Amino acid sequence: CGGERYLDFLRFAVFVNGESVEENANVVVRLLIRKPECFGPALRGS
Amino acid sequence: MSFYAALIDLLGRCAPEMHLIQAGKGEALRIRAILRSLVPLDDLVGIIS
Amino acid sequence: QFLRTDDEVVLQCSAEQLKLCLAAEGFGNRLCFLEPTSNAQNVPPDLAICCFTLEQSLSVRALQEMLANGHRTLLYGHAILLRHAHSRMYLSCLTTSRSMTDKLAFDVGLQEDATGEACWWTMHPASKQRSEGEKVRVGDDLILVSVSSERYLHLSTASGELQVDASFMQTLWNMNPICSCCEEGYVTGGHVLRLFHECLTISAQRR
Amino acid sequence: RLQESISDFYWYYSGKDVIEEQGKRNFSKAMSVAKQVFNSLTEYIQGP
Lengths: 46, 49, 207, 48
Hints:
The structure is cut from a larger assembly and holds four copies of chain A.
Chain A: H1 4-10, E1 15-16, E2 19-20, H2 25-32
Antiparallel strand pairs in A: 1-2
PDB class: membrane protein
Keywords: Ion channel, Membrane protein
Entry title: Structure of chimeric RyR Complex with tetraniliprole
């Protein structure tokens, strides 16, 4: 419940006007894989 | 299920757009490798059905 | 006292505490394994397949106009191209997965082609002691990241024994210079040589 | 830190043929501060 209060923010951070940005998308995923605990642990796996 | 509904559609909305895949942008196709590498496709099919 | 181009190194890790050098066979068994070296007193390990020359080193944007297209010392935040000195081919990060556990841990092997997709790696300083722009000193802790896959060359302890893989765990690595530019007409280690005075043969249980 | 930062700006433009208007205004900036710092360097050593 608590972690879902950030991804609804970040899905406004890279997707606008029905289109994806480039410069933020190429740096959120480079940073999201530095801490693989940030993914849900069933796929970190079941 | 609502949390994993958020982890999925975020990365769907960070997928590089199709017209950059028609060009040979190696950085842009490096990311499209990684997101496809993370998730098995047939996991979605049992979820979609 | 500082590393440069065209001088062989040997990647060694640390895990009781135990130093594992990283070698790979080639011409058959294109994947890489580990080999320990902390027990050199009772058993000499094999260094024949562990030599690695750095034949080029560029900046990050520098190779970007090599792909669309003599002794330079190197820095953190540069790119690197290793060559397996015995097999005359290049280290790379491969496409498959030798994990078979959905770990998304890629497997490290060798490559014959000189394409620049997955052959290249970038180094990174371990702590905040050094940073970008500084030279690599001899014996400093390094983190090696893929260029094509953006994963880290790390040791893995999960599947029974130990092996090396590319996934999202960082692992310290010593570069450990093994042979710089030697003078002609002199001998160093690793030299294959003959012993005349008439050779020193064995028989073709041959002891 | 200025030196690598200007050199990697060359490698981005080393593939391009022509330079547009905003590309030069950036590059006009970095050398104008470079001439300032070499001049500020040499006044540490103009005296013997």
